[PDB]
Amino acid sequence: AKPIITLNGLKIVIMLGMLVIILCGIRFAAEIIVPFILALFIAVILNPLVQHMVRWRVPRVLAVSILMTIIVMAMVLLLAYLGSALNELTRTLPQYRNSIMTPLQALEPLLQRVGIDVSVDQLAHYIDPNAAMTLLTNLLTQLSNAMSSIFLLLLTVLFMLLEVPQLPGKFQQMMARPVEGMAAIQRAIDSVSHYLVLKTAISIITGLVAWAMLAALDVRFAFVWGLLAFALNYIPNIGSVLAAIPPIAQVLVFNGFYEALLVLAGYLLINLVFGNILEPRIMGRGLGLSTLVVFLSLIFWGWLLGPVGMLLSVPLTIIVKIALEQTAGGQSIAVLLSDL
Amino acid sequence: AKPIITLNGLKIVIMLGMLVIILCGIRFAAEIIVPFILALFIAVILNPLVQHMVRWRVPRVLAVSILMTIIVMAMVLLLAYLGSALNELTRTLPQYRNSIMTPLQALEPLLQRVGIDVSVDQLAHYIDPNAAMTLLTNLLTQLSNAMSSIFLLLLTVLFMLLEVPQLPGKFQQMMARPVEGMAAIQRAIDSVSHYLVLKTAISIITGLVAWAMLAALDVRFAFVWGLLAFALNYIPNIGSVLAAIPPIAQVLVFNGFYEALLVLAGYLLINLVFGNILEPRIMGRGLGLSTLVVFLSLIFWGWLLGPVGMLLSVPLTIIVKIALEQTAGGQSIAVLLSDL
Amino acid sequence: AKPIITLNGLKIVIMLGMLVIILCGIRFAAEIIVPFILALFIAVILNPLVQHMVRWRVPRVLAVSILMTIIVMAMVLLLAYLGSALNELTRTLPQYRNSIMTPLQALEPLLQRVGIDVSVDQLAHYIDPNAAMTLLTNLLTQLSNAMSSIFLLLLTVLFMLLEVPQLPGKFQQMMARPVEGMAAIQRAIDSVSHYLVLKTAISIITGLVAWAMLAALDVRFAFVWGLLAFALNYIPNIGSVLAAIPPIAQVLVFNGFYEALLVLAGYLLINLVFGNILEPRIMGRGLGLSTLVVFLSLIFWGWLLGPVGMLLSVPLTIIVKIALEQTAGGQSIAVLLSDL
Amino acid sequence: AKPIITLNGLKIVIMLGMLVIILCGIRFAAEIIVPFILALFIAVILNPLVQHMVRWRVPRVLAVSILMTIIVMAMVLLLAYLGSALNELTRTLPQYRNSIMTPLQALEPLLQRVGIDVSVDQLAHYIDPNAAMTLLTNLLTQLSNAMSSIFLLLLTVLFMLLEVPQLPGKFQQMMARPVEGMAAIQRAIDSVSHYLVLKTAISIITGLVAWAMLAALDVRFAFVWGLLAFALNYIPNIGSVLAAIPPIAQVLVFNGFYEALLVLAGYLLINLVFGNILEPRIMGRGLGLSTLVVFLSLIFWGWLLGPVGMLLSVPLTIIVKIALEQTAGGQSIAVLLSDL
Amino acid sequence: AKPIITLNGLKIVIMLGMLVIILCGIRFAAEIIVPFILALFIAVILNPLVQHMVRWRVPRVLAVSILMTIIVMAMVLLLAYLGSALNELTRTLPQYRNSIMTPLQALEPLLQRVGIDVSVDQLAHYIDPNAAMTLLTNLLTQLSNAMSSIFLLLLTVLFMLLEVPQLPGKFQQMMARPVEGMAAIQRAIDSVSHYLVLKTAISIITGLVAWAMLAALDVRFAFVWGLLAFALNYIPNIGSVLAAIPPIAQVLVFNGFYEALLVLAGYLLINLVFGNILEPRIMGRGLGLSTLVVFLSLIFWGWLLGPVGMLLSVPLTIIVKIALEQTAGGQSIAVLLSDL
Structure with a gap:
């Protein structure tokens, strides 16, 4: 054109x-x-609990105070338990590394082979040691420096829970159609709130069941693996599969094959029943994130928001999708993020 | 839509x-x-004093000059006193650290326990030493390098106080509705000015009362704790509670339990009477910052404006709230920051 | 004017x-x-293969799963082979460096000369060692750290291939004229998709033919040179010429002149027949990038997107050209990028 | 509102x-x-001189050339003199530092004292050594590296002076109301030009008078103190007071009290007569910078433009004020910067 | 106003x-x-040559290929010659540094002097060694690392020259009034192209003449000084004067005064005849950059575009001036950059 x-x-x-x-x-x-x-x-998760506890005619401030003390004590104790177990794992690591190293040496002389072993040696280093080394580093920096910020975060949670009672009056007194599209009678947080509550219930169930079953199969660090399964259950399909690995690795490299197969069968049972209770119990909507979008949001949020961004990606992408669902211009993007 | x-x-x-x-x-x-x-x-705080001193028929420039000399001499003397007391505290620190360390060792053998001690050892390191170490570092960098900038700041205060007399003519001669919404007959600084004056009066009273009561209970660094209580009284609800801790820690770890309980009772009396004189004396408005917003503004301002941003957060958030209160479009945000 | x-x-x-x-x-x-x-x-490249494999009545998920396992195993094996061959080349380097150094000393005493040798010594250092040193560094950082990200990339490819079946319903359900100008019935990805498929077929053919011919001329690293020719075949005219060099250098500096001439004749045959099969087989359009624009896009994308940006430049510039071809205002730029 | x-x-x-x-x-x-x-x-300052020299029927280019040679030779000589005097001061520093240190030790045992001496020792370190140390560093980095850029700056000045003759034709041939508001018949540089000329005349007079009077009181570095007074005379009220200090410090710490009082009386005489000749001689406008705005502009410009920004702040703020004085929308800010 | x-x-x-x-x-x-x-x-410069060579019925691609081989061989040879000569100069430097140092010692005891020598010693260090040291560093980093990028640049030049034949069809087929204001029948590159061709012809003539005359006066590095004069001839008035210095310094500090005066007379003859052939031969326009604007553009472009930005400043500022000359709004700036 002219311009x-x-x-x-x-x-x-x-x-x-x-x-x-x-x-x-x-x-x-x-x-x-x-x-x-x-x-x-976290405040959204804990609000139903506090509200029910109020229904038992308990003072609001008292209820939230005792609940926060419970939570902080549990976190400190869990940090201690994690420190002990993690240090034990660190000092136990290389033995089964060599144990799984030996079959590579056994399988190297393939008939009519052309490659070398040392590069595959480094790939195995990636498999057993290196991924364990990275997990070691991340978790240890957590237990080392996190207590400076975990306390801060818990303080923030406490304040939000404390102030919730006056919030509905504040939203009611403020029409501002954007804000009613974010969280009001036009529910766009009650959508995410319910998803978080249900997903956390499911994740707790999965973590406890995995821990109990691992204890029934007397593997070491059964509790840590249960915790890891619980934490990774938040990523819908990648998370459970990724969490199922380290216990399988430990049981196979220590004990053997039949028991490892039984343990993997246990994980399959867990993730299928909770691929079959998550959907029908409540949340028949099955909040619409296509697996590709789940993975992409994982990479994205984890890249800008940092590691914990990965953990909170999916709820956050659900939030963005819901918000852009009702906006007139952006509804196209919202349907693009959905699943069918 | 089409676009x-x-x-x-x-x-x-x-x-x-x-x-x-x-x-x-x-x-x-x-x-x-x-x-x-x-x-x-600071100029806003000191302006009523200078104006009253003028009411005693004292030259304006002379009054502000003598007042600034008083203030700067007091700051230098207080820096010296702080240096001595701080160094004494630094060299006295670890003894009661070990004194409070020993009960952890006593309480470690809980019946049917599962964790370790070393992580809880590090948590105690967080409690007594580390927080003391961070306070040490911050205060010492203050007394070390601050005198380069404290003098600059006092100079700025002096100039503002000097020029105040001509300012009303300048605002009067300049309608510019935005500026009258910031500070004019449409008072949006006279709101913050009165809050600052009253809050500083209350904070001075609290600091002096705490210092006197601590002297009546012959604890070391009574003056430093009084100063800390005064400084932290600016954050409405978090500040007093956070300031009440270090004296309680010192009195408990040195003397014992009954006297520590009496001291905490003294702090409760102070903060309740000034939870009962701050509101009704003047400022019946009870400037509307919900506790959550207080904490969030604390974190926010302290993150962008740096540490002292934390100290001046609440006045600054009050300023922003007042300014956006009267703006037509933004009144929604202003009511969102308020309390009910 | 006035303003x-x-x-x-x-x-x-x-x-x-x-x-x-x-x-x-x-x-x-x-x-x-x-x-x-x-x-x-990569997903675009592999989609026709998976779709044809589906035409053989194979489950979609099963097909893509087995294909991805094949690809990842091949990449790991190729990384091992590359590590061995690269290390051998590194430890073999300087011998023929000196072998080609000696003719420089022979040719230095030109009759009535004025310059020095040491600077030309450094230029030769640029020719044989330095370019080899840079290629060494780049390839070795690849084989060293890439396996952390190659796995991630393959995971992304797997997810895209998995989700493709539902994508057409999503584009169909979303008019949004911009998106139909990007990829719809108004084909602006089917243009690039076909180009990528055809160019990759040609590049595979070229790489395999070069590898086979080099094996027929028993030169060392015949496979690595074949791989390099395949990789560089993506840049249309610069890439093949640049890839033809290192084999010629090796054969000349080890064996001699007549065989090197024969090898260069082989490369000329390859690149002329594929300067004569690429165009007429399919893609009679001969996607319109003038050689200058090819080089400039190479420099540009490689500068902002980093090294691999160079490899994917040409497809990416084709994408941009196609997108701006149909935009009303920007059609001028699109015709500027074209060739005639 | 709705939005x-x-x-x-x-x-x-x-x-x-x-x-x-x-x-x-x-x-x-x-x-x-x-x-x-x-x-x-500098070009604005020197233009009247060159123009008058032209009035003596001297070639323009010749006049500016000889004037620039004079200036550059004077700067080189002054750099040498400054280097010698500065090094002498550096190696003489600590003796009177200890001389003024001893009265602090004498005055430490105040009856019923509570503080320590070491912090006040550091404050004195701030007073005599540290401020001298910072002045040392700044001036020495000047005399060290400045000659790389002083020559460049003088070159720029030479070119501007050379091209001035054709400039009026260029402004005349270009209406562009913004530019006529910057510098035209609507004088907004002739305002600043006259201020600079008068202020520089006054500053030269002050510097020479201070140097002569200090020589009459046989103090060391009389010339350097005269130069410093001249340089600081550009900041209207802060500059002279700040410049009067180092000579007073030297004379008091070396000689004693009565002579120091006489010297301070001399400075008061100088700054009052030039608080009484600057205004009435010419520039009865008394360019309107309130002292607060002077200080704030000092801090501002010195923060973004760097140190020398402090020196040229006041002229620069005058420029901004004049420019925004006549702009329709911004006249409010312009009256805000003024004084009354 | 109201807003x-x-x-x-x-x-x-x-x-x-x-x-x-x-x-x-x-x-x-x-x-x-x-x-x-x-x-x-460079492509603009070399295009007339290639076009004339085509007029001799030579294939276009063949012509540009041979010309680029010529250019690259000449650059490599010149890099070698420069390396040798530069190293010789580096190892010869300090002797005449001391030779010119001694007259400073002779002239130090000026009657009734007040300064020191060491600062003037450092100024002389600036004169002979330091400027030579900076030139050493810049030129040596060129000859060291430039060959990585000089080859790239020559490649770009080759591609541009190759593609020129199809360009006129592309501009013709694309009206887009902005682009016709940049380079079309509305010539705004043919303006700069002719300037570059003529200025390069003049610069080559000046460089060769200076080299020949220096050889006639048997000074060392006559060729390097000729090259430097050629390179600096691009900056119209500053460049020649700045280039005339180092040969004068060398001839004076080695040989003496009369021969140095003769050499400076030779440079004056060169720069006056080419202050008297550049203008009247062709380019009677005398492209309108006032000397001040030349210097300012030099500083500007050299600051953002880096060192070589200084070399290509003047052509680039001419480009900007021509482009903004015809734009309706910006013609004011264009006349501001001009000369009269």
Whole structure:
């Protein structure tokens, strides 16, 4: 045309440029956004419990206070247990590394082979040691420095729970159609709140069941593996499969094959019954994240929000999808994120 | 719709992008914004005093000059006293650290226990030493390098106090409805000014009372604890509770339990009477910051404006709330920050 | 004119400023954009294969699963082979470096010469060692750290292939004229998809033919040179010429002149027949990138997207050209990128 | 209202965001902006001299050439003199540091004292050594590396002076109401030009008078103190007071009290007569910078433009005030910067 | 007015903010912009030669190929010659440094002197050694690492020359009034192209003449000084004067005064005849850069585009001036850059 800079071109480019600026803003302010978001989600999870406890005619402030003391004591105790178990695992690591190393040496002389062993040696180093080394580093930096920030986060959660009673009056007194599209009678947090409550119930059930079954199969670190399964259950399909690995690795490299197969059968039973109780119990909607979008959101949020961004990705992407579902212009993106 | 980039979408994204830019601007220029804001608040605090001293028929410039000399001499003397007391505390620290360490060893052999001690050892390190170590570092960097900037800040305060007499003519001669919404007959600084004056009066009273009562209970560093209580009294509910801790820790770990309980009772008396004189004396408005918003503003301002941003957060959030209270579009946010 | 800031001036400057912001956004988020784009292209390449395998009445998920296992095993094996061959080349390097060094000493005493040898010594260092040193460094950092990200990329490819079946319903259910200009009945990915499929077929043919012919001429690292020719065949005219060099260097510096000439004749035959089968077999369009634009896009993408950006430049520039071809305002740029 | 993002809100936020961007631009390009601005001011200062010398029927180019040679030779000689005197001061420093240290020890045993001496020892270290140490560092980095850039700046000044004759034709031939508001018949540089000329005349007079009087009181570094007084005379009220200190310190710590009082009386005489000749001689306007705004502009410009930004702050703020004085929208800010 | 944020204010601030963004974009992407721009200019220079060679009925591709081989061989040989000569100069440096040092010692005892020698010693260190040291560093980093990028740049030049034949069809087929204002029948590159061709012819003549005359005066590094004169001839008035210095320094410090005066007379003859052949031969326009603007553009471009930005500044500023000459709004800036 006569001008090359079409006004629609300007709209597109301004939108993209300002989105880039916003993302660099979030990536830069991650150390607030992450604790605040996570505190918000924990508050959402714990609010039904506190509300029911109020239904037992218990003072609100008293209830939340005792609940927070319970939670913080449990976290401190769990940090101690994790420190002991983790150190034991660190000092026990290389023995079964060599135990699984030996079959590689056995299988190296394939008839009419052309490659070398040392590179596959490094790949095995990736398999047993290196992934264990990275998990070691991440978890140990957690138990080392986290207590400086876990306390802060719990404080934030306490304040949110305390102030919840006055919040409905504040939303009611403030129409502002954007905010009613975020969380009001036009429920766009009650959607995510229910999902979080149900998913956390399921994850607790899965973690406890896995821990109990592992104890029934007398494997070491049964509790840590149960915790890991619980934590990873939040990522819908990748998380459970990824969590099922380390126990299988331990049981196979220590005990053998038949028991490892039985343990994997146990995990399959767990994840199928909870592939068959999560959907029909409540949340028949089956909140619409296609597996691809789950993985992509995982990578995305974990890249800008940092590691814990990975843990809270899926709830956060659900939030974004719900918010853009009702916006007039953006409904296209919202249906793009959905599943069918 | 036919276009995905709705004009309202552009408005939202431009507003958010430009807010991100502004915040990165403030975070980047913190070393001016902080001293300037703090000098402004100190000038507001000291203006009534100077004005009353003028009412005693004292020259304005003379009055402010003598007052600033008084203030700077007091600050230098207090820095010296703080240096001596702080060094004494540093060299006295670990003894009662071990004194409180021993009961942990006593309580470790809980019947049917499963955890370890070393992690709880590190948690105690967090409790007595580490928090003391961080307070040590922060206060010592203050007394070390602050005198380069405290003098600058006092100079700024002096200039503001000097120029105040001509300011009303300048505001009067300049309608500019935004500025009258910031500070004019449409009072939006006289709101914050009165809050600061009253809160500082209360904080001085609390600090002096705590110092006197601690002296009546012959604890070491009674003056430093009084100063700390005064400084932390600015954060309404978190500050007093957080300030009440270190004296309780010292008295319990040195003397014992009954006297520590008496001291905590004294703090409760102080903070309840000033939970019962702050509101009814003057400022029946009880400037509307919900406790959650207080904590969030604390975290926010302390994150971008740096540490002293935490100290001046609450006045600053009050300023923002008042300014956005009367703006037509933004009144929703203003009611969101309020309390009920 | 009366104002200097013409509105058209604002449009131009806003467009340019926001483009700069976007580019700094991509350059900053390269570690996602690159794996995601590359996974998208690999998925496009492999989709016809999986679809044909489905035509053999094979389950979709089963087909993609087995194909991905095949691919990952092949990559691991190839990494091992590359490690061995690369280490052998590293420890063999300097001998023929000196072998080609000696003719420089022979040719230094040109009659009536004026220069020195040491600078030309450094130029030869650039020729045989240094370029080999840089290739060494790049390839070795690949085989060293890549396995952390190659697995991630393959995972992404697997997810895309898995979700493809539901995608057409999602595009169909979403008109949004921009998206139909990107990939719909208004084909702007089916254009790039076909180009990628055909170019990859040609590149595989070229790589295998070069490997076989080099084996027929019993040169060392025949397989590595075949792989390098395949990889560089993606850059249309520069890539093949640049890839033809290292084998010629090796054969000349080890064996001699006549055999090197025969090998170069073989490469000429390959690149002329595939300068004569690429065009007429299919893709009679001969996707319109003028050689200059090919080189410039190479430099550009390789500068912001990093090294692998160079490899995927040409497909990516084709994408941009196709997208801007149909846009009303930008068709000028699209014809500028074309060839005639 | 129905939308929260009021259009006025967008205007405010866009203005602030773009101002932040501009300031980050200037802060980033300081190493050009500062020499260019300073060269412009020096050219303005020297233009009347060159023009008068032309009135003596001297060739323009010849006049400016000889004047620039004079200036550069004087700067080189002054750098040498400064190097010698500065090194002498550096090696003489600590003796009178201890001389003034001893009275602190004498005054430490105040009756009924509570503090320590070591912190006040560090405060004295701030007083005599540290401020001298910082002045040492700044001046020495000047005399060390400045000659690389002083020559560049003088070159720029020479070019501006050379090209001035053709400039009026260029402004005349270019209406562009913004530029006539910057410098034209609507004088907004002739305002600053006259201020600079008069202030520099006054500063030269003050520097020479102080140097002569100090020589009459046979103090060491009389010339350096005269230079420092001249340089600091540019900041209207803070500068002279700050410059009067180091000579007083030297004379008191070496000689004693009565002579120091006489010297301070001499400075008071100088600064009162030039608080009584600057205003009435010419520039009865008394360019309107309230002392607070002087100090704030000092801090501001010195923060973004770097140290020499402090020296050229006041002229620069005068420029900004004059420019925004006549702009229709911004006249409010202009009256805000003024004095009354 | 009622609003302070005038719409014109927004236009000004948006223009300035986006210009700052663009400049930070160029400063950030300098390592592409510089080689691309420089390759474009070299292609423009060499295009007439190739076109004339085509007029001799020589194949276009063959002609450009042989010309590029010639150029690259000449560059490699010149790099070698430069390495040898530069190393010789480095190891010869300090002897005449001391030779010129001794007259400073002779001239130190000026009657009734007050300064010291050591600072003037450092100034002489600036004169003979330091400037030589900086030139050493810059040139040596060139001959060291440049060959990695010089080859790249020559490749770019080759591609541009190759593709030129099809370019006129592409511009013809694309009206887009902006592009015709950049380079079309509305010539705004044919303006710069002719300037570059003529200026390069003049610079070659000057370099060769200076080299020949220096050889006639048997000074060392006559060729290097000729090259330096050629390179600096691109900056119109500063460049020749700055280039004339090092030969004068060498001849004076080695040989003496009369021969140095003769050499300076030779340079004056050269630069006056080419101050008297450049203008009247062709380019009677005398492309309008006032000397001040030349210097300012030098500083500017050299600051953002880096060192070689200084070399290509003047052509680049000419380009900008020509482009903004015909734009309706910006013609004011274009006349501001001109000369009269």
